[PDB]
């Protein structure tokens, strides 16, 4: 009957929020493009409290972590190429002839380099791939670099490695990462088995298109994830149970000559052909791909009803868009992934699929324009050993569904992995009625009001407290300190100098909640209660501040006389 | 806005020791440099400028038909181009011949203002951090 | 320096009459020098009227 407001600090409550997370690298230097120095060392053992009774709603397609990863990887890519040589004096008209052998793919190009010595003009010979070389005239021998006229071409430093390294994202103080531990999760929906993690699992930022290379696999069955499943033109991420294997080789052996540009800067180019001119023939085991296509078309028939499903190749066009593109060995491959999607299923030649591939050195990454990167050639054969881990399918009318290898920007290459994780902002302050007057972190979040009110200590303890990454981290830490001082000042103005639980003695009106203490301190989670009194939060807070502290302060001011 | 007339207080103001003026100077310089930083540098343009005059409250001698040799997108090839310049932006060289240069490019990294950046003044309010305040003098004279 | 603040403002109207065209000369890969083009009309002078 005689109920009073009591303020509880450290409540296991949260709401959806978007922030910047700290990148952490495995403890395990190589100057790898995604800099190790930027990212903190990983904790030796992660903690994964298995939140019980918590059924949170996840949605891969509205997830700020994916966009944050896109921005972070773009920033790290640009910063890694910042101090490397810029190929400004190489737009010169190139006299090119076909290499005497593929046919016409490699061009023997002569050009006059005018070095910074400025008393010589050196005629030099170099080999360029056909994809990077475009005509400039009706003369069949005069060409230029493909994108050097509308962009500044940055040469990648040969000392930068492109080998994938697992990168974790760890929550800052004041936020939490909730992981969905289900096995057949469909990306968008409620999750029945939720845990809280400080950092995510190892994520290899593999860059590829039409197909996801390396990474985690499904545990129960092949999982097909799409936001709507009927609008079309929405990537149908496919995660597999068993991994096919993309063995890929570039047979040709090449020698890398260097040409001075300025004092301490060099353009690394292709010297001459050693051995015969072969082609890059990626080998995929046909039987295994058969099985994978079966285990995918079954699920697609389940989702799209028993229609005939046809896997077609992508629509024709320029090689960069249409063809699959590895990041293996430091050489950018573009493979004609047509034999893999050439089947009608409804309801015999060879045993290995050989995909031809073309190597390209001048590239435009992240779908940007006006910027371009030159990858210097690698001496010797390149022998990949990748693992088929996922597919990206897109849809296009006689009762047949046409699926094609499609995809999108690199965000869709990480929705396939960060589909079991969500970032949540925690608001530790809450209020509840009591009779008085003046496990791990969120482990009791799904528990009732009673017996969750005994664990605020851990949540209160663990909730709070150079360069571009530096400034972002400084802004994040300052914001966290701000939040913490917001909470502490709210507690101070409420007369709770240092009391996780502080009784107010403000009367508990019956227009907020009419439920009795038994039905308020049991039968409900802190989430349902915080939602319930959401509208009255401002009013209640006002009453805790105005009605008491002021009056209590005046009273104590009047007690010493 | 939150303005509170302070009664019974008389305060000594001195604008010539007002640190806000220097702070605004730093602010404006930094804004100018920030706005001009992601724009075109005209260093490749500073060349021997062989410039004639333009034949027309009429003007006389102010606008000059000024030509120079520039590199095209192929680097090796050169192209002859022309533009009109005012007398003030050009400096004579080689005594009294028609060769000119661009003023101050002998010692400064001439930056071009991006055309999409507007120089229109917009009112700027200065606000102090919490724990500080700004006292306004309301005496008419 | 002596700073004078006035009771009432004085309108000043300034005109640049000479009609202009902008020509863009490429400096490099995606860098433009925006500059003078042809002059349209007669060559008068820019004046301020107070």
């Amino acid at each position: 009957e005689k109920l009073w407001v009591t303020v509880y600090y450290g409540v296991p409550v949260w709401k959806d929020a978007e922030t910047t997370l700290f990148c952490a690298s495995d403890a395990k230097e190589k100057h790898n493009v995604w800099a190790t120095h930027a990212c903190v060392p990983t904790d030796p053992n992660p903690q994964e409290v298995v939140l019980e009774n918590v059924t949170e709603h996840f949605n891969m397609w509205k997830n700020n972590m994916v966009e944050q990863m896109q921005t972070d990887i773009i920033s790290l890519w640009d910063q890694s190429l910042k101090p490397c040589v810029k190929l400004t004096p190489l737009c010169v008209t190139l006299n090119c002839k076909d290499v005497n052998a593929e046919r016409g793919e490699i061009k023997n190009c002569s050009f006059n380099i005018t070095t910074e010595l400025r008393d010589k003009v050196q005629k030099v010979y170099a080999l360029f791939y056909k994809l990077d070389v475009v005509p400039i005239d009706n003369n069949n021998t005069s060409y230029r670099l493909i994108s050097c006229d509308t962009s500044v071409i940055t040469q990648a430093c040969p000392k930068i490695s492109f080998e994938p390294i697992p990168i974790h994202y760890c929550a800052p103080a004041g936020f939490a990462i909730l992981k969905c531990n289900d096995k057949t999760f469909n990306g968008k929906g409620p999750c029945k088995n939720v845990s809280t993690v400080q950092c995510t699992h190892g994520i290899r930022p593999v860059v590829s298109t039409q197909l996801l290379l390396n990474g985690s696999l499904a545990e129960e069955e092949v999982v097909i994830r799409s936001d709507n499943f009927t609008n079309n033109a929405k990537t149908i991420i496919v995660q597999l149970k068993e991994s096919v294997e993309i063995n890929c080789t570039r047979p040709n052996n090449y020698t890398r000559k260097s040409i001075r540009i300025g004092p301490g800067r060099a353009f690394y180019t292709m010297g001459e052909i050693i051995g015969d001119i072969r082609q890059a023939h990626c080998n995929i085991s046909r039987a295994k791909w058969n099985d994978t296509l079966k285990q995918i078309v079954i699920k697609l028939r389940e989702q799209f009803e028993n229609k005939t499903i046809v896997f077609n190749h992508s629509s024709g066009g320029d090689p960069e868009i249409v063809m699959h593109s590895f990041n293996c060995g430091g050489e950018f491959f573009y493979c004609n992934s047509t034999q893999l999607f050439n089947s009608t299923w409804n309801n015999t030649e060879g045993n290995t699929i050989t995909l031809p591939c073309r190597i390209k050195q001048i590239i435009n990454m992240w779908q940007r324009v006006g910027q371009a990167m030159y990858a210097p050639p690698i001496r010797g054969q390149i022998r990949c050993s990748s693992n088929i881990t996922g597919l990206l399918l897109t849809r296009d009318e006689n009762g047949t569904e046409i699926f094609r290898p499609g995809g999108g920007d690199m965000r869709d290459n990480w929705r396939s992995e960060l589909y079991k994780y969500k970032v949540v902002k925690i608001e530790p302050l809450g209020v509840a009625p009591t009779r008085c007057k003046r496990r791990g972190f969120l482990g009791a979040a799904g528990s009732t009001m009673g017996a969750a009110s005994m664990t605020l200590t851990v949540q209160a303890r663990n909730l709070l407290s150079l360069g571009v990454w530096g400034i972002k981290q400084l802004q994040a830490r300052v914001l966290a300190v701000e939040r913490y001082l917001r909470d502490q000042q709210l507690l101070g103005i409420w007369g709770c100098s240092g009391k996780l639980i502080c009784t107010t003695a403000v009367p508990w009106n019956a227009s907020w909640s009419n439920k009795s203490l038994d039905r308020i301190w049991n039968n409900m989670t802190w989430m349902e209660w915080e939602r319930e009194i959401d509208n009255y939060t401002s009013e209640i807070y006002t009453l805790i501040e105005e009605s008491q502290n002021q009056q209590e302060k005046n009273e104590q001011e009047l007690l010493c006389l | 806005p939150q303005e509170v007339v302070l009664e019974n207080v008389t305060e000594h103001f001195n604008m010539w020791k007002n640190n806000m003026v220097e702070q605004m100077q730093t602010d404006i310089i930094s804004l100018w440099d920030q706005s001009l930083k992601p724009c075109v540098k005209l260093t490749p343009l500073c060349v021997t400028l062989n410039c004639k005059d333009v034949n027309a409250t009429m003007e006389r001698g102010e606008i000059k038909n000024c030509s120079f040799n520039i590199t095209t997108e192929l680097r090796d090839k050169v192209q002859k181009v022309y533009a009109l310049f005012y007398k003030l932006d050009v400096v004579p060289i080689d005594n009294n011949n028609t060769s000119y240069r661009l003023i101050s490019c002998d010692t400064s990294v001439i930056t071009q203002a991006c055309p999409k950046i507007s120089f229109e003044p917009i009112p700027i309010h200065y606000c102090a951090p919490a724990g500080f305040a700004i006292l306004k003098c309301n005496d008419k004279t | 320096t002596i700073i004078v603040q006035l009771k009432e403002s004085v309108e000043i109207n300034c005109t640049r009459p000479n009609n202009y065209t902008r020509k863009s000369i490429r400096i490099g890969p995606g860098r433009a020098f925006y500059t003078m083009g042809e002059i349209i009309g007669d060559i008068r002078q820019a004046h301020c009227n107070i």
Partner: antibody, heavy 121, light 106 residues
Framework: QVQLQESGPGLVKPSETLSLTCTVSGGSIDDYFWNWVRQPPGKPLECIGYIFGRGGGTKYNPSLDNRVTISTDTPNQFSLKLRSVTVADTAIYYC?????????????????WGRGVLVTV | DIQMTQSPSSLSASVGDTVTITCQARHAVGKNLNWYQQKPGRGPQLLIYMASSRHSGVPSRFRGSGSGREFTLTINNLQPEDFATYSCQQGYTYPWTFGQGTKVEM
């Protein structure tokens, strides 16, 4: 205040050469791609080709089997030549200015369009 | 080439309502999208460039945003002068394909 005006015949029979001329008023030709585009009835706009500056590099929509040639005739006029015109080529043809520079409005977009001329077959 | 589609093919609206037009790319184009306005008897006008930047002199009411293959143009407070055919164009690969076009009716 750059304006573009197309001119040329409004009726060309099949298989001869279709000739159009875009004249630039207001300003002289400058280092922006000058592009010919068309809109057939009931179809989206299709790029035909472009030329850079006053004589220079060109590029043409690959899916036309090299039937198109573009060149500059006068410092304020450029022209489109389209060979082997067929009945499918009836369209409203526009000439447009495509910007290369990110320091001005309309970066990588047809900032300036002409009125457009309807050519049938 | 890269196929572009948009939705709806046509819609009706009155003065003062908000209109949303979705442009979908068959392949990712980054932020390199432009929005054009076409009226009878007049050449196309540029409304938005680089998918979120309004062109000079365009009314503030026109708002456009997106990334990857997905973009949306929102016209708030529809004016009688804004009834026109709106189209989206890419900018990454040449030819820069346009789109079917959405006609805004009274």
């Amino acid at each position: 205040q750059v304006q573009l005006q197309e001119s040329g015949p409004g009726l060309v029979k099949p298989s001869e050469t279709l000739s159009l001329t875009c004249t630039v008023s207001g300003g002289s030709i400058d280092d922006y791609f000058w592009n010919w585009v068309r809109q057939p009835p009931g179809k989206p706009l299709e790029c035909i080709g472009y030329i850079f500056g006053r004589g220079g590099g060109t590029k043409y929509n690959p899916s036309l089997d090299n039937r198109v040639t573009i060149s500059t005739d006068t410092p304020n006029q450029f022209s489109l030549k389209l060979r082997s015109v067929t009945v499918a080529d009836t369209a409203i043809y526009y000439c447009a200015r495509w910007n290369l520079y990110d320091d001005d409005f309309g970066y990588n977009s047809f900032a300036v369009w002409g009125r457009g001329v309807l050519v049938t077959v | 080439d890269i196929q572009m589609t948009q939705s709806p093919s046509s819609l009706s609206a009155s003065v003062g309502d908000t209109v949303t037009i979705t442009c979908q790319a068959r392949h990712a184009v980054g932020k390199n999208l432009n929005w054009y306005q076409q009226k009878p008897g007049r050449g196309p006008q540029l409304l938005i460039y680089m998918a979120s930047s309004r062109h000079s002199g365009v009314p503030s009411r026109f708002r456009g945003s997106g990334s990857g293959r997905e973009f949306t143009l929102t016209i708030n407070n529809l004016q009688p002068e804004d009834f026109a055919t709106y189209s989206c164009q890419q900018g990454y690969t040449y030819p820069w394909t346009f789109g079917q076009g959405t006609k805004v009716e009274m």
